Design a protein around this ligand. Structure first.
Ligand SMILES: CC(C)CCC[C@@H](C)[C@H]1CC[C@H]2[C@@H]3CC=C4C[C@@H](O)CC[C@]4(C)[C@H]3CC[C@]12C
Ligand SMILES: CCCCCCCC/C=C/CCCCCCCC(=O)OC[C@H](O)CO
Ligand SMILES: CCCCCCCC/C=C/CCCCCCCC(=O)OC[C@H](O)CO
Ligand SMILES: CCCCCCCC/C=C/CCCCCCCC(=O)OC[C@H](O)CO
Ligand SMILES: CCCCCCCC/C=C/CCCCCCCC(=O)OC[C@H](O)CO
Ligand SMILES: CCCCCCCC/C=C/CCCCCCCC(=O)OC[C@H](O)CO
Ligand SMILES: CCCCCCCC/C=C\CCCCCCCC(=O)OC[C@H](O)CO
Ligand SMILES: CCCCCCCC/C=C\CCCCCCCC(=O)OC[C@H](O)CO
Ligand SMILES: CCCCCCCC/C=C\CCCCCCCC(=O)OC[C@H](O)CO
Ligand SMILES: CCCCCCCC/C=C\CCCCCCCC(=O)OC[C@H](O)CO
Ligand SMILES: CCCCCCCC/C=C\CCCCCCCC(=O)OC[C@H](O)CO
Ligand SMILES: CCCCCCCC/C=C\CCCCCCCC(=O)OC[C@H](O)CO
Ligand SMILES: [Cl-]
Lengths: 456, 27
């Protein structure tokens, strides 16, 4: 059940995959990788709805609490990327520290999390694409999820997934320079909203600071936690990094700490321009600029959001596909094969099927539910890795660690407590989907999962 | 790297130039 995977074995698979691949990537390229995976739908969309219905102007404290939970968690991931510098996240770490049973549960949870996160990202993207087009407007009933009045499907959200699914299937190799271009488009547009929006900030809009009390700051924090998911993606590039033991921890923590500051500033400027009660909009940042008659800058920020949110979508789908290739190689799920040449067949993952699943949920499920369901799965993964550092310090203490978590028990415990606190802040119905999904996975392990590449 | 740092820095400046410009010409 708790049969651990030796770190030596994880080095061999990473060393076989990254033998051909060229190494250039440094601390800067990995910070871009991190920022690219972090800034997206969370800050561009969730921030509006969360300020209007959960915290109000106090959404800034809701970003601090939520931001602190991720810092303590990211510090744990950095110790893991320093110690096990292989192309892989939480699934690989749990397999080395806890063992097969914990790695399967978390693994199966993240198959859902990356899928559900892609739908939430694509729903957010749609609201910015629709907002930009008007000023145009498509058929009224193909603009959002199925409610009681109007809309049936969110067609732009269905379409963007299919465009991303077509790109990943085209097999076009990644360019670190091209990623520096898009990440700068995203960073510059955020700074532009801050620099232009500061002039129109009415401190009157901040006066009823905590209208929903601290209870509202806490539920708000569980929502806007989503915006911080993405720092784990720095482990992808491990087979292309010269010295990954000290560059990947830098990338993880730096990309996170940068975004936390932008996030605090965006919250203040947003609630400062528009009264909290008017921010429940599909495009809050474009709306705030339109509210104060900066129409040209608003469209320019809508463009940056479209291009910038698209990179979040590509990462999420890739991280899921990579995760399916890892679970099946370990024998915990069956092996699919497809001919790469007319006479040469290799292991395959059906991206058209994994992408179709995402496209459907993106077109029918409201953003809030999708985000809340990603938040539960991610918080439990974060708690697992945090304890993983402690378990790896007790068992296997001799391992080389270029980066070490500052305070040996305290910080990993704090991450467990802060994340644990945010889990208790999510709606009760969010547990129905998450738990039932885990029961399905737990059944899979006893029937199939015990017929894998470590039973021997 | 290096080229990737310069490429990043240059586009921030291009967008911040174009942005500050368009912002000036508004009610
Ligand atoms: C680094 C930051 C703080 C400084 C640069 C900000 C740029 C974007 C500034 C420089 C001058 C600014 C303008 C100065 C004066 C006015 C008139 C007033 O009705 C507020 C908006 C408006 C129209 C400003 C819009 C933003 C603007 C173009
Ligand atoms: C220069 C010649 C251009 C010719 C014009 C036609 C090509 C269209 C290209 C689109 C960009 C998308 C490229 C595909 C990027 C895939 C990234 C990937 O495989 O994974 C994600 C990565 O690891 C983390 O972001
Ligand atoms: C302690 C802070 C240390 C950091 C120092 C950074 C200084 C950056 C430059 C600022 C000048 C521009 C000020 C723009 C401020 C927004 C406008 C404002 O506050 O009021 C409207 C104005 O007074 C009537 O037009
Ligand atoms: C690239 C550089 C971007 C830098 C962006 C700044 C950082 C974010 C700070 C936010 C707090 C804002 C506090 C400023 C309050 C100003 C009040 C003001 O301008 O009031 C005028 C009037 O009341 C209304 O029209
Ligand atoms: C094996 C099964 C054993 C049975 C136990 C399973 C847990 C059921 C939980 C229900 C939440 C009920 C929520 C009711 C609505 C109140 C929401 C609210 O305001 O909550 C504030 C705070 O969270 C204080 O509950
Ligand atoms: C504090 C108030 C806000 C002010 C905001 C300032 C930041 C924006 C920078 C613009 C210049 C960007 C272009 C210059 C940097 C790229 C070129 C470079 O670094 O070097 C040249 C060459 O590439 C070597 O080989
Ligand atoms: C939303 C669906 C509509 C999408 C519409 C997209 C535009 C298609 C037009 C021309 C193809 C360009 C052909 C000219 C480029 C020749 C080089 C080439 O084949 O580049 C591919 C690249 O190297 C590896 O991706
Ligand atoms: C007019 C016809 C022009 C020719 C057709 C070109 C296709 C359309 C353009 C861009 C695709 C944008 C999609 C988003 C690309 C994201 C790339 C990315 O982040 O790739 C991973 C990175 O290289 C490592 O981290
Ligand atoms: C900063 C306010 C947010 C505005 C957006 C800025 C975007 C800048 C982009 C990338 C950062 C490049 C990496 C940061 C370089 C500093 C690295 C560092 O602090 O330390 C290196 C090492 O760990 C020894 O201590
Ligand atoms: C501070 C509160 C948070 C509010 C948000 C920040 C506002 C400050 C604005 C611009 C900083 C400059 C951004 C330009 C990115 C620089 C990229 C880089 O390479 O930085 C390393 C070094 O500074 C190269 O000299
Ligand atoms: C949270 C409760 C909601 C639960 C929502 C359940 C969604 C099920 C929908 C579609 C499945 C079909 C699409 C997935 C097909 C997978 C194909 C694939 O990945 O094949 C490669 C193989 O896995 C290599 O090991
Ligand atoms: C058998 C046990 C299985 C595990 C079952 C776990 C059930 C969820 C737990 C706690 C939150 C209960 C209330 C959930 C709905 C309200 C939203 C919330 O959590 O808090 C609201 C806040 O306190 C005011 O706004
Ligand atoms: Cl006007």
């Amino acid at each position: 059940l708790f049969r651990k995977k030796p770190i030596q074995l994880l080095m061999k698979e990473s060393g076989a995959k990254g033998a051909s691949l060229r190494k250039e990537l440094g601390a800067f390229d990995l910070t871009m990788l991190g920022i690219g995976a972090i800034i997206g739908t969370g800050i561009f969309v969730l921030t509006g709805v969360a300020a209007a219905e959960h915290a109000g102007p106090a959404l800034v404290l809701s970003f601090i609490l939520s931001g602190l939970a991720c810092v303590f968690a990211a510090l744990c991931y950095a110790e893991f990327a320093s110690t096990v510098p292989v192309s892989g996240s939480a699934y690989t770490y749990s397999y080395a520290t806890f063992g097969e049973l914990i790695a399967w549960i978390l693994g199966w949870d993240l198959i859902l999390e990356y899928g559900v996160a892609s739908s939430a990202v694509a729903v957010g993207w749609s609201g910015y694409f629709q907002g930009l087009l008007s000023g145009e407007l498509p058929k009224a009933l193909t603009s959002a999820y199925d409610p009681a009045k109007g809309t049936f499907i969110d067609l732009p959200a269905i379409i963007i997934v299919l465009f991303i699914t077509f790109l990943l299937n085209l097999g076009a190799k990644k360019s670190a320079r091209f990623n520096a271009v898009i990440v700068a488009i995203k960073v510059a547009v955020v700074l532009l909203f801050l620099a232009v929006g500061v002039w129109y900030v009415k401190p009157e809009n901040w006066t009823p600071f905590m209208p929903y009390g601290f209870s509202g700051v806490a539920t708000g924090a569980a929502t806007v936690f989503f915006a911080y998911i993405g720092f784990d993606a720095v482990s992808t590039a491990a087979e292309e990094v010269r010295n990954p033991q000290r560059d990947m921890p830098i990338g993880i923590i730096v990309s996170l700490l940068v975004c936390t500051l932008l996030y605090i500033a965006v919250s203040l400027v947003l609630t400062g321009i528009v009264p909290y009660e008017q921010l429940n909009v599909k495009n809050p940042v474009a709306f705030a600029l339109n509210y104060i008659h900066q129409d040209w800058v608003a469209g320019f920020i809508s463009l940056g959001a479209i291009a910038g949110i698209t990179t979040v979508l590509l990462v999420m789908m890739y991280g899921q596909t990579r995760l399916f290739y890892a679970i099946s190689r370990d024998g915990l799920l069956p092996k699919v094969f497809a001919r790469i040449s007319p006479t040469r067949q290799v292991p395959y993952v059906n991206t058209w099927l994994t992408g179709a699943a995402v496209a459907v949920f993106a077109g029918i499920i409201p953003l809030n539910k999708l985000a809340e369901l990603t938040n539960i799965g991610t918080l439990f993964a974060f708690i697992t890795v945090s304890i993983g550092v402690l378990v790896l310090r007790k068992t296997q203490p001799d391992l080389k660690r270029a980066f070490r978590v500052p305070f040996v028990p305290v910080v990993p415990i704090l991450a467990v407590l802060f994340c644990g606190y945010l889990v208790l802040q999510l709606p009760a119905m969010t547990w129905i989907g998450f738990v039932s999904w885990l029961l399905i996975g737990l059944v899979i392990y006893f029937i199939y999962g015990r017929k894998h590449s470590e039973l021997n | 790297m290096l080229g990737n740092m310069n490429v990043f820095m240059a586009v921030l400046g291009i967008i911040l130039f174009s942005g500050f410009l368009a912002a000036y010409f508004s009610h």
